[PDB]
Design a protein around this motif. Structure first.
Motif, short mmCIF file in Angstrom:
data_model
loop_
_atom_site.label_atom_id
_atom_site.label_comp_id
_atom_site.label_asym_id
_atom_site.label_seq_id
_atom_site.Cartn_x
_atom_site.Cartn_y
_atom_site.Cartn_z
N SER B 16 0.66 -1.21 0.73
CA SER B 16 0.01 -0.45 0.14
C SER B 16 0.85 1.25 0.39
O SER B 16 1.99 1.00 1.10
N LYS B 25 -2.32 -10.17 -2.27
CA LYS B 25 -3.05 -9.80 -2.99
C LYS B 25 -4.38 -10.07 -2.31
O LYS B 25 -4.95 -9.11 -2.75
N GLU B 29 -7.51 -6.80 -1.20
CA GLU B 29 -8.68 -6.39 -1.43
C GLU B 29 -10.13 -6.86 -1.33
O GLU B 29 -10.44 -6.23 -1.37
N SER B 36 -13.48 0.97 1.44
CA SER B 36 -11.74 1.65 0.68
C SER B 36 -11.03 2.46 2.12
O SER B 36 -10.87 3.31 1.71
N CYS B 45 -7.97 4.37 1.20
CA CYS B 45 -6.29 3.95 -0.16
C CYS B 45 -7.45 2.97 -1.54
O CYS B 45 -8.55 2.85 -0.97
N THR B 46 -7.40 2.63 -2.53
CA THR B 46 -7.94 2.24 -3.49
C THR B 46 -7.47 0.77 -3.82
O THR B 46 -6.46 1.02 -4.04
N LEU B 47 -7.72 -0.17 -5.08
CA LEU B 47 -7.74 -1.23 -5.38
C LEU B 47 -6.20 -1.22 -6.50
O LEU B 47 -5.22 -1.91 -6.88
N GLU B 48 -6.03 0.40 -6.98
CA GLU B 48 -5.24 0.53 -8.04
C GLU B 48 -4.46 1.55 -7.39
O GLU B 48 -3.43 1.71 -8.60
N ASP B 49 -4.05 1.43 -5.87
CA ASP B 49 -3.64 2.28 -5.29
C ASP B 49 -2.23 0.83 -4.91
O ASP B 49 -1.56 1.52 -4.79
N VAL B 51 0.16 -1.57 -5.68
CA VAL B 51 1.93 -1.94 -6.23
C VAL B 51 2.33 -3.46 -6.09
O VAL B 51 3.02 -3.65 -4.80
#
Lengths: 62, 131, 84, 132, 49, 49
Positions: B16, B25, B29, B36, B45-49, B51
């Motif tokens: 994150s 992962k 999720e 969120s 924070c979001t899912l696309e955030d 790495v």
């Protein structure tokens, strides 16, 4: 696997959780506490099934 | 080495960016799908955030032993039987630490009522000493 | 009336945390209450389970038959496939 | 079950080998004859590249059920991965209770020294004044 | 290889589904059914030859 | 950059032998062979037929 099929005998599983006994000892104190957590997991496992209910079943039937 | 949600060694860890924390992962999720947020810092924070981090080397398989397979059935039975009680014991302790905390809060507020009467007995004494 | 005060509270909190983990490890009179707590659960939960089951069963034993009699059709649709 | 181009139930499903998606043969065939491409990804695809859906070969399958060994193993992941989050709900809430207990017991330990001095001072003022 | 997408597959987990039957009865039947089938399948390959 | 180790509110489980999550991973790995064996056994079954 070949020995289990040849002999015609399935390996015995944990025949413990279902029976148990009241006023036991430290051993049945564990066996009792096992029945609670799995019963709570059970009653939560029956909640998420009934929420959808027959819609999830008939979707797989199609 | 450890994902800070379950306690596993992560097989596809993701970090994150709002708070420096390598999660798994699957588990991160489910938390984002619930609400969120980040589980440690409670930041938006979001899912696309996320790495996806790379850890090719650390992966080390457990080779239990030559061990009989019918016995490995009863091991997995015992290990689920143990984790069920290791989850249970950790929850009744949380309820009783909160319960014993609530008994301290009553004594804390009951004591500061008893100091008000003791201050009056001191105030009554300081008036009599002056006379 | 009430840095050094922050560390003395963190050390005492770790000591009480070790005493809480020690009182829990010894247990795992008291055993009869937990068994009766389960008998309430077993009663309350399994009655809900039997209600959830029989409600599901009434709707889903029909859909099981529907789904299970359809599975037997694959076992014959396959067996003829090979002979052809 | 559906065709991604039309949205109907396709009566002759053929899966493409560039964008993996089940298209209806009669629909996708016209899409290829318009221009040699896959409708979704816009990657090149010909009619020979498309492949009908088939029975695997000679191994017989059974439908996806709860019994099936792989479906049962992926089930036990759901069990543990959910129970692992159940532990966080109690680990995170424990770190708030013990943190509030630590500050509560410190305020109790800082205050009870002042109760001990007022019980001394108010009785000492009664011991002093009554004697005079 | 090329990954493909579909509307996902759904299995209705039985009404009598708990950790108990899934650990004991269901998992036992799965390794019985794997064992007695492949042994019987090895018997079928021997007779074909 | 995100620095330093991460373990907090987690408890350390050094990749344990008698744990739980890898037992299911091991159960998958042995099944993966079971399927690969059943395929090659069936090919020769039908190819001989």
């Amino acid at each position: 696997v070949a020995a289990g099929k040849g002999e015609k005998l399935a390996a015995i599983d944990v025949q413990r959780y279902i029976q148990l006994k009241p006023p036991g000892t430290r051993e049945s104190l564990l066996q009792s506490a096992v029945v609670w957590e799995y019963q709570k997991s059970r009653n939560d496992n029956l909640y998420l099934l009934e929420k959808h209910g027959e819609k999830a079943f008939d979707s797989s039937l199609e | 080495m450890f994902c800070s949600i379950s306690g596993e060694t992560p097989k596809e860890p993701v970090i994150s960016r709002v708070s420096g924390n390598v999660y798994e992962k699957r588990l991160i999720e489910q938390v984002i799908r619930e609400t969120s947020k980040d589980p440690v810092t409670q930041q938006e924070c979001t899912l696309e955030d996320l790495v996806p981090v790379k850890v090719p080397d650390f992966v080390r398989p457990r080779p239990p032993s030559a061990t009989s397979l019918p016995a490995l059935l009863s091991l997995f039975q015992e290990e689920w039987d143990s984790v069920a009680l290791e989850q249970f014991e950790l929850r009744r302790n949380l309820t009783e630490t909160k319960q014993e905390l609530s008994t301290a809060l009553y004594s804390l507020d009951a004591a500061l009522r008893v100091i008000s009467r003791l201050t009056k007995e001191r105030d009554e004494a300081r008036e009599a000493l002056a006379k | 009336x009430x840095x050094x005060x922050x560390x003395x509270x963190x050390x005492x909190x770790x000591x009480x945390x070790x005493x809480x983990x020690x009182x829990x490890x010894x247990x795992x009179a008291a055993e009869k209450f937990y068994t009766n707590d389960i008998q309430r659960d077993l009663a309350k939960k399994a009655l809900e389970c039997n209600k959830l089951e029989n409600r599901v069963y009434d709707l889903v034993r029909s859909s099981y038959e529907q789904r299970n009699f359809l599975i037997k059709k694959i076992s014959h649709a396959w067996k003829a496939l090979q002979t052809e």
